[PDB]
Structure 1
Amino acid sequence: PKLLYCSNGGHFLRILPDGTVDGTRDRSDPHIQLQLIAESVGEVYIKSTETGQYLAMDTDGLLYGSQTPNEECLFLERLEENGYNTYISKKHAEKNWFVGLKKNGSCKRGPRTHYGQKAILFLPLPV
């Protein structure tokens, strides 16, 4: 597993058993342990190690935790000069919708994200 740390609000990406996606600052949270799994080079699923759920973004730009993988669960990974990664929705890449966390640790919605934001920067860390 890895943790995905957002420096915008200082939160680890979290997928809860009920499929809620948000952020917590607590390093010890069981639900922040993630597996980044390759499809093709630079394409990844982001999977909850605890629940088995996959991070996904819906057609309304909303993040949720999917019981099973689908086309909404693929993200295009990029590093990013300062060691942080970005994750753009594969399905909505043309809109530049990203995985992001607000300063208050709740998720960002696709249209409210874009290249250049701190919200979209995640640092993969060891558990």
Structure 2
Amino acid sequence: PVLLKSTETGQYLRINPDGTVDGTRDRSDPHIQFQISPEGNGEVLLKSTETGQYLRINPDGTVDGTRDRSDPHIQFQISPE
């Protein structure tokens, strides 16, 4: 169970029950709880422990979550910097 924080603003990533995604500085929020699931091909999946939906980036650049286990948009690569 991991948290995804944007060091910059000091904000954590959050997937709300309605499927909307935003950033909060409220560390006492269960919705900022994530789990990184492998894919065998190096890639991973970003899924909320609570809501249980997977994180996707729409083609038009908008971001939300769907519990659809099948959709290459939830495919993510973690690139160390």
Same fold (TM over 0.5): yes
Higher helix proportion = 1
**Aligned AA for 1:59?**
P
Q: CA deviation at 1:54?
A: 0.5
Q: What does 1:111-126 align with in structure 2 at a 5 Å threshold?
A: none
Higher strand proportion = 2
Q: CA deviation at 1:41?
A: 4.5
RMSD, aligned α-carbons: 1.1
Q: In structure 2, how many angstroms separate the alpha carbons of the residues matched to 1:12 and 1:42? A: 24
The corresponding residue for 2:17 is 17
Q: In structure 1, how many angstroms separate the alpha carbons of the residues matched to 2:5 and 2:62? A: 19
The corresponding residue for 1:119 is none
Structure 1: runs of 5 or more not aligned = 81-127
- Indicate conservation of the 8 Å contact 1:16/1:31, yes or no: yes
Which structure exhibits the higher relative contact order, with contacts defined as CA atoms closer than 8 Å and separated by 6 or more residues? Answer: 1
The corresponding residue for 1:55 is 55
Identity %: 54
Q: CA deviation at 1:25?
A: 0.8
Q: In structure 2, how many angstroms separate the alpha carbons of the residues matched to 1:44 and 1:55? A: 11
The corresponding residue for 1:125 is none
Q: Which runs of 4+ in 1 moved over 2 A?
A: none
Give the TM-score taking structure 2 as reference length: 0.91
Give the TM-score taking structure 1 as reference length: 0.60
Q: What does 1:1-127 align with in structure 2 at a 5 Å threshold?
A: 1-69=1-69, 70-80=71-81
